[PDB]
Amino acid sequence: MSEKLQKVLARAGHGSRREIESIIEAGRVSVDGKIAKLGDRVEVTPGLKIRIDGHLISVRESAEQICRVLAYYKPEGELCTRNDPEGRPTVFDRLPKLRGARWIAVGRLDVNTCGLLLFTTDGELANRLMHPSREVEREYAVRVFGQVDDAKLRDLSRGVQLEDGPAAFKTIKFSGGEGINQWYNVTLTEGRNREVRRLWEAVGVQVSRLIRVRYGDIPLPKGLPRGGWTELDLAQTNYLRELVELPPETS
RNA sequence: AGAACGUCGUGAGACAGUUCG
């Protein structure tokens, strides 16, 4: 009943897992006064003393960790990265400051794509939401141009061959016309690169606009400005946890 | 082949990884 040291320290807000591995590898991290090595595990208990460069780090048990969730209306022009080699804007730039924890992005969006991005302090929740084993729904509003008929919708639902293998939309619903364009709401239960655009392209349809409008049981909040965040309340956080079989928080 | 982040994993490697660039 233990965890890799870098998992614990990342949860505590002291860097990413792999960043922390570098610090461990450099002999800078100790447990109970003894230098830790890469791969070491610890069991968080009240008296455990983990230090980085001699400085004590306050840590928490995994199951008792802070589980906050934000809904963010990700705007075009921001990257889903914590460290862009080129220094371009990121989705983390305006999120509220946290100590003793950090925001984890639940998946990524393309820079030029708008829509809902969840963040959470709880990396178990994050992975359970992202990993396709639990088949969490991602819903997009898609504006397309091209011939579409029920046969095409059938093909997209039953599986088409993409460059990186078979893929299918889980649901597809016509949501309205506009000009020489139609809107559809579609869902996927995985998240391959540009998958929504590439599915439509595979059946000869081009995508002019693409907005992520729901992740799991959390819709893009009504009235949330583009580029704005809002924090989910306890009930909503618990609903999201329950979706991926995590127990509810009481706080 | 340029990166990020989670999750497993005494470090060798992994995921039904994530709409990265």
Author numbering: 1 to 251
Wording from the paper:
Escherichia coli RluB (1–251) was co-crystallized with a 21-mer RNA stem-loop identical in sequence to the target stem-loop in 23S rRNA except that U2605 was modified to 5-FU to block the last step in catalysis. Crystals of this complex in space group C2 contained two independent RluB–RNA complexes per asymmetric unit, which are essentially the same with an rmsd of 0.9 Å. The 21-mer RNA stem-loop binds with the target base 5-FU2605 flipped out into the active site cleft and the loop region abutting the S4 domain. The stem-loop has the same secondary structure as it has in the context of the large ribosomal subunit, with A2602 forming a bulge. The target nucleotide, U2605, is flipped into the active site of the enzyme and RluB has turned over 5-FU2605 to give rise to the C1′-C5 glycoside bond typical for Ψ; RluB (1–251) is catalytically active against the 21-mer. But in the RluB structure, one of the RluB–RNA active sites shows clearly that Tyr140, perhaps fortuitously, forms a covalent bond with C6 of the isomerized base. The second RluB–RNA complex is statistically disordered at this site indicating a mixture of covalent and non-covalent complexes. Arg108 intercalates into the stem where U2605 is flipped into the active site, and stacks between base pairs G2588-C2606 and A2590-U2604. RluB stabilizes the bulge with a repertoire of hydrogen bonds involving side chains of His131, Ser133, Glu135 and Arg138, and flips out U2605 into the active site. More likely, stabilizing interactions between the bulge and residues 131–138 connecting α1 and β4 (RluB nomenclature) prevent stem-loop rearrangement in RluB, while absence of such interactions allow rearrangement in RluF.
